[PDB]
From Swiss-Prot, chain A:
Belongs to the class-II pyridoxal-phosphate-dependent aminotransferase family. Histidinol-phosphate aminotransferase subfamily. The modification N6-(pyridoxal phosphate)lysine is found at residue 209. One of its GO terms (molecular function) is histidinol-phosphate transaminase activity. It catalyses: L-histidinol phosphate + 2-oxoglutarate = 3-(imidazol-4-yl)-2-oxopropyl phosphate + L-glutamate. InterPro entries: Aminotransferase_I/II_large, HisP_aminotrans, PyrdxlP-dep_Trfase, PyrdxlP-dep_Trfase_major, PyrdxlP-dep_Trfase_small. The keyword Amino-acid biosynthesis applies. It comes from Corynebacterium glutamicum (strain ATCC 13032 / DSM 20300 / JCM 1318 / BCRC 11384 / CCUG 27702 / LMG 3730 / NBRC 12168 / NCIMB 10025 / NRRL B-2784 / 534). This is Histidinol-phosphate aminotransferase. Transmembrane segments: none annotated. Its EC number is 2.6.1.9.
UniProtKB/Swiss-Prot annotation, chain B:
Its cofactor is pyridoxal 5'-phosphate. Keywords: Amino-acid biosynthesis, Aminotransferase, Histidine biosynthesis, Pyridoxal phosphate, Transferase. Homodimer. Coiled coil: none annotated. The lineage of its organism: Bacteria, Bacillati, Actinomycetota, Actinomycetes, Mycobacteriales. Pfam families: Aminotran_1_2. The keyword Lipid metabolism does not apply. This is Histidinol-phosphate aminotransferase. InterPro entries: Aminotransferase_I/II_large, HisP_aminotrans, PyrdxlP-dep_Trfase, PyrdxlP-dep_Trfase_major, PyrdxlP-dep_Trfase_small. Its EC number is 2.6.1.9. Pathway: Amino-acid biosynthesis; L-histidine biosynthesis; L-histidine from 5-phospho-alpha-D-ribose 1-diphosphate: step 7/9.
Length: 347, 357
C-alpha cells in the first residue's frame, strides 16, 4: 500500500459561542431567503459572469462612491482564487510578491501553486506599516507585486490612502490592495485611487465576511478594464458556475439589509475594543469585524474553558476575537476581564 | 487609451433548437427540484474537505462502475478544469510536460499557461482513433510526466479500450489521467476498474456537468488511489468548493436514478442519429458520448451556417471536414436529421474575406 513518497510529486511540494472565524453572525433577511429559493427554483427548472459583474459594480459604486461598471469588475469562486489568477498573470516563475507581516492575504499555497516567490517585510512595533522600511524594501527588491491589506488581518489596522499612494508610486509592477474587511471601516476605499493609477492598482474584495447566502462564496476585484483582459488569459473557463453566480447576485440585491448588520457589527467593535482597554489589554485600533489584543495559547485555552472560542493566529503575545452579536460580545468580555503572569518555553 | 500592453503582464501571456453544447436537455425531476429548494432553504437559514459530497460521489461511482470505492478515493472541485489544474500543479508544472492525442478538448491551453506545464500533442489516426504505434512511440520518446486519454473523446465520440489504455499506462513514466467526462453515455467499462492494478499512475477524471442538471451547479471530480487525494491537498485552494456548491451536488447525486434514465434515453437516440447520418451518406465516427462527429464537408463552416439557417445550432470545433452535433430530445434530433438530409446534396461554399493587416 502506497504513500505520497511513492508518487512523482514535484519535490519542492514535499462549543457554543464561536468568535474565531471572521464572518457575519446575523441571520439572513426573510426577503433574501425568499429571493434565493425562488431563484434556485427558477434556475433549477431549466428554461463571463456579466450580470454578476453589473451587480458587483453597482454594489461598489454605492459602497465606495466611485462610479464603476462591469468592465472594472472581475469575480471568482473566492479571494484565494482572485489572487491566484492575478499571480498567474503578473507573478509566477522568476517574479516576486512582497507583503507586510503579519498578514493572512499571502497564503503560502498561492506561492507554491503559482511559483511566485513571496517576500515578507515586518510591520512596526505598533503593528502598522513602517513606511520608511516599506518604501526602502520595495525600491531595493523591485517586487513585481506589492500587497497591502487594509483593514489588516489579524491586526485590524488600516493604512491611509496617502501612504498607499506612496507605496504605489515606488512599486514598479502592480499593487493589490486587499479590502476583504473594508465593509466594516469608515475610511475611504482605494477604489478612489484607480483613476490615477490605472496601470498599477487592483482593489481586491470579498463577500464572505459581510454577506451570507446559502454558503455561497465570492471573491472579486475592482480595476481598470485592462486588468480584466489580463486575468481572462489565465482564468479557468467556466470557473464560476451559474449557481454560484445566481446566488451571489441574490445576496447583492439584498445588500441594503446586509449593510445594516455590518453597521451593527462596526458599532459593537468600537465597544469591545474600548472595554478591553479598560480591562488593561493593549488593543490595536481596528476597522474590521475583529479585534487584535493581548500582551497566548494558554490564554486561548482559558477562553475556551469558559465556552468562548476565539482565534490564536500564532502571533506572540496576542489573540484575535471576531465581533459577534452583543450577547456573544459580553460573554467574551466577561472571560477576558477574568483572564487577567508568566510561564516558560521548553524543547 | 490604457491597455493590456501598459500592464506588467507575464510576457508569455501576450435561436430555438440548440445542439451545440454537450449537456443534458431533459428537465429535472420534480423530486430533484423539491429537494434542491428545501436544501437551500435549510442551508440558507443558518443553524473540512467536502467529505459528505465525497461519500456520495464514491457511492455513485461504485454503482456506476461496479468498482468499490470510498471518499478516500474521491476528490471534488468546482469543475473538470479545476480538477486538471490541481493535478497539473501537483504533477506537471515548470520543467514538466503533458502529452495528449488530438483532436481533444481536455487539454485547454489556459491550463498549460496557468500551471506552466508544456503541452505536447500527438495526432490521432485518420479514423480519429488513437494510433497506438505513434502513441506509445512518442511517450517512449518524450517521457511525458502526464499522459491524457479522453474516453469517450470530445469532439470525436470515440472510446479507447481498456487494453489500449493499459498499454499507454505501462509505457507512461509519470501519471495517466483518463478523462471520462462523457462516460455516463457509454456502455463500455470505466478505467476505475484499472485503479487497483496501477495505484501510482492512474487517475480517473469525471464530471457531473454533462449528465446532471442541478440549478446550474457544476462539479468535477476524480477517482484514484488515496495517495492522490493527499497530493492535490497540497495545491488545492482552501475552501475552493463552497457549502452551496457541495450541497447542490449532493442533491443531484441522491436523485441520480432519475438522471441515469435520461442518459439512457440520450444514448439510445445517439445510436439512431448516427445510423441515419450514415444512411444519408455522412461519414460518422463511432461514438459512445452524447454527441456525434460527422461530415466530410468541403467547407464545414459553410455547412454549419446551413444548419443555423434552418434554425439548428450545432458546433463547429474547427476540425476540417467535420461538425459536432450533441444529442437532444427526439424532436430536436429529427429537426437536425431533416436539415442534415437537405444539406448532404448541396455544394456549399462560403469563403471569408482574408486578413487585412
Amino acid at each position: 500500500k502506497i504513500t505520497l513518497s511513492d508518487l512523482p510529486l514535484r519535490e519542492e511540494l514535499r462549543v457554543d459561542i464561536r468568535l474565531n472565524t471572521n464572518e457575519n453572525p446575523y441571520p439572513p433577511s426573510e426577503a433574501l431567503v425568499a429571493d434565493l429559493v425562488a431563484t434556485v427554483d427558477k434556475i433549477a427548472t431549466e428554461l463571463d459572469a456579466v450580470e454578476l459583474r453589473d451587480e458587483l459594480a453597482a454594489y461598489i459604486t454605492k459602497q465606495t462612491g466611485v462610479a464603476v461598471t462591469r468592465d472594472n469588475l472581475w469575480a471568482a469562486n473566492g479571494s484565494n482564487e482572485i489572487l491566484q489568477q492575478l499571480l498567474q498573470a503578473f507573478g509566477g516563475p522568476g517574479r516576486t510578491a512582497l507583503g507586510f507581516q503579519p498578514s493572512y492575504s499571502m497564503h503560502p499555497i498561492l506561492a507554491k501553486g503559482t511559483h511566485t516567490e513571496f517576500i515578507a517585510v515586518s510591520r512596526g512595533a505598533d503593528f502598522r506599516i513602517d513606511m520608511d522600511v516599506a518604501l526602502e524594501e520595495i525600491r531595493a527588491k523591485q517586487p513585481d507585486i506589492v500587497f497591502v491589506t487594509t483593514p489588516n488581518n489579524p491586526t485590524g489596522d488600516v493604512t491611509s490612502l496617502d501612504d498607499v499612494e506612496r507605496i504605489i508610486n515606488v512599486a514598479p509592477g502592480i499593487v493589490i490592495v486587499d479590502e476583504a474587511y473594508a465593509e466594516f471601516s469608515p475610511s475611504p476605499s482605494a477604489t478612489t485611487l484607480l483613476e490615477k493609477y490605472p496601470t498599477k492598482l487592483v482593489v481586491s474584495r470579498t463577500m464572505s465576511k459581510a454577506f451570507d447566502f446559502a454558503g455561497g462564496r465570492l471573491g472579486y476585484f475592482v480595476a481598470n478594464p485592462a486588468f480584466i483582459d489580463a486575468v481572462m488569459l489565465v482564468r479557468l473557463p467556466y470557473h464560476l458556475s451559474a449557481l454560484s453566480q445566481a446566488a451571489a447576485i441574490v445576496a447583492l440585491r439584498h445588500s441594503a439589509d446586509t449593510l445594516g448588520t455590518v453597521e451593527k457589527l462596526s458599532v459593537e467593535r468600537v465597544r469591545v475594543a474600548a472595554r478591553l482597554e479598560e480591562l488593561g489589554y493593549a488593543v490595536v485600533p481596528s476597522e474590521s469585524n475583529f479585534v487584535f489584543f493581548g500582551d497566548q495559547h494558554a490564554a486561548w485555552q482559558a477562553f475556551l474553558d469558559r465556552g468562548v472560542l476565539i482565534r490564536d493566529v500564532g502571533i506572540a503575545g496576542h489573540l484575535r476575537t471576531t465581533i459577534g452579536v452583543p450577547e456573544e460580545n459580553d460573554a467574551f468580555l466577561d472571560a477576558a476581564a477574568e483572564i487577567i503572569l508568566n510561564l516558560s518555553a521548553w524543547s
